[PDB]
C-alpha cells in the first residue's frame, strides 16, 4: 500500500502548518488579552501549549511516511510517541480540571504543573514501551510485544474509567441543571401570566382564591431563583405583598375589589419582574452557550484521538484500512481545535473579527 503512505504526508504537512499558525494566533491573543483571563481561558491555554508542543514535529511524521519506512533512530520515535502521549493526556487532564472548575462554578498554575507531571508520567510509560520492530521486512515503528503490561492496563483503567465517566456525570449534571434552571423560569413566567388571565375571568364562580394561590407559590420560587441583588428580591416582596392584599379581599367576598388589586398585579410584573426575568434569561442563556463550547471541545477530543488509541491497543495485544482511517483522525485534531473555536465559540469570534479589522 504505497499510495496510502504517498497521500498521507502532504495533508499531514498542511494540517501541521495550519495548526501551528492557528495555535500561535491563539497564544498572541492571550499575549495581548491578559485581563479577562478566566480559569477556562488558562486551561485551554495550557491545552494550546500542549498543542504547539505536538505541532512542530508532524514534518518528521511526514518524511517518515514519504520514504516508505522509518529513517531516524529509535529514540526519535520514542520521543515522537512521547510528545503525542503528553498531548493526549494533557488534553485529558486539562478537560478534567475544566470539569472540576465548571462543576464548582455551576452546581453550587500549580495544577497545570500537575497536569504536566501526569503527562510526563505517561511519557515515561510510553518511553519504556516503544521500539522499532522491523516486521515483514519493513522497519516501521509500532509498539508491540509482564509487570509493564499490567501497569499499562491499570493506568488505562484509571485514565479511562475515572475521567470519561466523570465527563459523562458532570456534563449530564450540567445539562440537567442549566436546562432545568431555564425551565424553572419558564413555568414561573407562565403561571404568573396564565393565572392572571383566570383572575380577570373569575367573576363567574369565585375562582379568585384558587388562582392567586398558584401565583403565591410560583412567585415565591422565582424570588428564590449587592445593590442590584437588593432590587431583585424587593421586586417580589410587593408582587406577593399585593397577592395577599388581593387574597385578604378574596376571603371577604370582595371580588370586585379583588380585580382592582389584580390591576396592580400587572404593574409590578412589568416594572419589577419582566425587567429582571429577561435579565436573568440572558445571563442564563449566555452561560449555556459557553457550555456548548466546552461540550464540543470535549466530545471531539473523544471522537478523534480515542478511536485511534483503541486500535493501537488491539494491534499491540495480538484490517489495515481500519488502522489507516484512524491514523489520520487523531493527528487531524491538532489543527481541528482552532476550526471549532471560530464557528462555535462566541467569544473567539469577536476578537478574531477585531484583529481582522485592526
Amino acid at each position, epitope marked *: 500500500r504505497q499510495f496510502s503512505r504517498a497521500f498521507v504526508p502532504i495533508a499531514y504537512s498542511l494540517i501541521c502548518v495550519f495548526g501551528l499558525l492557528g495555535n500561535i494566533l491563539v497564544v498572541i491573543t492571550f499575549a495581548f488579552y491578559k485581563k479577562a483571563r478566566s480559569m477556562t481561558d488558562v486551561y485551554l491555554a495550557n491545552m494550546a501549549i500542549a498543542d504547539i508542543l505536538f505541532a512542530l514535529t508532524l514534518p518528521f511524521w511526514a518524511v517518515s511516511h514519504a520514504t516508505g519506512a522509518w529513517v531516524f533512530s529509535n529514540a526519535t520515535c520514542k520521543l515522537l510517541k512521547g510528545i503525542y502521549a503528553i498531548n493526549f493526556n494533557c488534553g485529558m487532564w486539562l478537560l478534567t480540571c475544566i470539569a472540576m472548575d465548571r462543576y464548582i462554578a455551576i452546581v453550587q498554575k500549580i495544577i497545570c504543573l500537575v497536569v504536566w507531571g501526569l503527562s510526563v508520567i505517561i511519557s515515561s510509560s510510553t518511553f519504556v514501551f516503544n521500539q522499532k520492530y522491523n516486521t515483514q521486512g519493513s522497519d516501521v515503528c509500532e509498539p508491540k510485544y509482564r509487570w509493564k503490561l499490567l501497569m499499562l492496563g491499570l493506568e488505562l483503567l484509571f485514565g479511562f474509567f475515572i475521567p470519561l465517566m466523570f465527563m459523562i456525570f458532570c456534563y449530564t449534571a450540567i445539562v440537567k441543571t442549566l436546562r432545568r434552571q431555564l425551565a424553572d423560569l419558564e413555568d414561573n413566567w407562565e403561571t404568573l401570566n396564565d393565572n392572571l388571565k383566570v383572575i380577570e375571568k373569575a367573576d363567574n364562580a369565585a375562582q379568585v382564591k384558587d388562582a392567586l*394561590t*398558584k401565583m403565591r*407559590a410560583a412567585a*415565591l420560587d422565582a424570588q428564590k431563583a449587592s445593590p442590584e441583588m437588593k432590587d431583585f428580591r424587593h421586586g417580589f416582596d410587593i408582587l406577593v*405583598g399585593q397577592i*395577599d392584599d388581593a*387574597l385578604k379581599l378574596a*376571603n*371577604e367576598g370582595k371580588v370586585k375589589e379583588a380585580q382592582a388589586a389584580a390591576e396592580q398585579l400587572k404593574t409590578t410584573r412589568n416594572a419589577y419582574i419582566q425587567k429582571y426575568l429577561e435579565r436573568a434569561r440572558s445571563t442564563l442563556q449566555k452561560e449555556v452557550k459557553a457550555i456548548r463550547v466546552i461540550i464540543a471541545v470535549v466530545l471531539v477530543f473523544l471522537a478523534c484521538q480515542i478511536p485511534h488509541n483503541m486500535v493501537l491497543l488491539v494491534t499491540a495485544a495480538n484490517i489495515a484500512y481500519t488502522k489507516t482511517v484512524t491514523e489520520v483522525l487523531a493527528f487531524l485534531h491538532c489543527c481541528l481545535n482552532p476550526v471549532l473555536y471560530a464557528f462555535i465559540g462566541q467569544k473567539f469570534r469577536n476578537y478574531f473579527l477585531k484583529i481582522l479589522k485592526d
Partner: antibody, heavy 124, light 109 residues
Framework: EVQLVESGGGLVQPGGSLRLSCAAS????????LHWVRQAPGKGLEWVAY????????SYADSVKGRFTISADTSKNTAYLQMNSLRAEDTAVYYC?????????????????WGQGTLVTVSS | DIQMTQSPSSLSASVGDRVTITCRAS??????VAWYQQKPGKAPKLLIY???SLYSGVPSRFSGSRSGTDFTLTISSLQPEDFATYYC??????????FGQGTKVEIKR
C-alpha cells in the same frame, strides 16, 4: 422571653358557648398574626382560624365557619376565640400560635412559639 | 384545598439510626413547609422552617430538603429525646395551612 398562655377551657354542654382567652406577653399583637390550632384527642393537628390585628382580617376553616368567632384586644395584648353551637366533634385541645408578617424572615418561621392550649370537652 | 400526605404512619428505629420522613403536597407550595415535633402531652415545637433552615434552638441533627413538591425531614442520629410525633405543614397562606397526618417515632425492639 416572649410567650403566650391560654385560658377559658373547660366543660360545656352541646350547643353551648365558650370564649377562650389567649394572653401574649413580651410582644404586641399588631406585629404578629395569631392562630388557633386544634388537636382532637388521639388525632392529628388541624388549623381553625386566624386574626390579623393590624388589617382586621379574620378567617375560619370550613368545619367551623359561622359557628366560631375570633377577636383580638391590643390593650390587654389578648386574643379571644368565641364558639357557639359546639357539636360533638369539637372536643379537642386548642393551641394559640403566633406568626410573622410579610415581608422578611418572620413569615417563614411558621408557628414559631406556641401556647400549651386548653382542653375543651363537650358532652351531655 | 391543599392536602399534605405524610407517607410513614408509624416509624420504628433505635438510638443512633438515621430516619427520613417524606411529605407530599397536592399542588406546588414553593419552599413553604415546616416540620413540627410534638411530645405526648405537650405543645408542638418548630424544628425546620422554609423546608431547609433549622430553627434557632433545635439541634443540628435535624435537616430538611425539598424536591419539587416532595419534602423530606432527615434525622442523622436518633436520640432518646427524638422519639415523638412529627408533622409536615404547608404554609402558603395564613388561611390555607394544612398539617400532615403525623409520624410516630417509636423504639425499635
Amino acid at each position: 422571653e416572649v410567650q403566650l398562655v391560654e385560658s377559658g377551657g373547660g366543660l360545656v354542654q352541646p350547643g353551648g358557648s365558650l370564649r377562650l382567652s389567649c394572653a401574649a406577653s413580651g410582644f404586641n399583637v399588631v406585629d404578629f398574626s395569631l392562630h388557633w390550632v386544634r388537636q382532637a384527642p388521639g388525632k392529628g393537628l388541624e388549623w381553625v382560624a386566624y386574626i390579623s390585628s393590624s388589617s382586621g382580617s379574620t378567617s375560619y376553616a370550613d368545619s367551623v365557619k359561622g359557628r366560631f368567632t375570633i377577636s383580638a384586644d391590643t390593650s390587654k395584648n389578648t386574643a379571644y376565640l368565641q364558639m357557639n353551637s359546639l357539636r360533638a366533634e369539637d372536643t379537642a385541645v386548642y393551641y394559640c400560635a403566633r406568626w410573622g408578617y410579610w415581608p422578611g424572615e418572620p413569615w417563614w418561621k411558621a408557628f414559631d412559639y406556641w401556647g400549651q392550649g386548653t382542653l375543651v370537652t363537650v358532652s351531655s | 384545598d391543599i392536602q399534605m400526605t405524610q407517607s410513614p404512619s408509624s416509624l420504628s428505629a433505635s438510638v443512633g439510626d438515621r430516619v427520613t420522613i417524606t411529605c407530599r403536597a397536592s399542588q406546588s407550595v414553593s419552599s413553604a413547609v415546616a416540620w413540627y415535633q410534638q411530645k405526648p402531652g405537650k405543645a408542638p415545637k418548630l424544628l425546620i422552617y422554609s423546608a431547609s433552615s433549622l430553627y434557632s434552638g433545635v439541634p443540628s441533627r435535624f435537616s430538611g430538603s425539598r424536591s419539587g413538591t416532595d419534602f423530606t425531614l432527615t434525622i442523622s442520629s436518633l436520640q432518646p429525646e427524638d422519639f415523638a410525633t412529627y408533622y409536615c405543614q404547608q404554609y402558603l397562606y395564613y388561611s390555607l395551612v394544612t398539617f400532615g397526618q403525623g409520624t410516630k417515632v417509636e423504639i425499635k425492639r
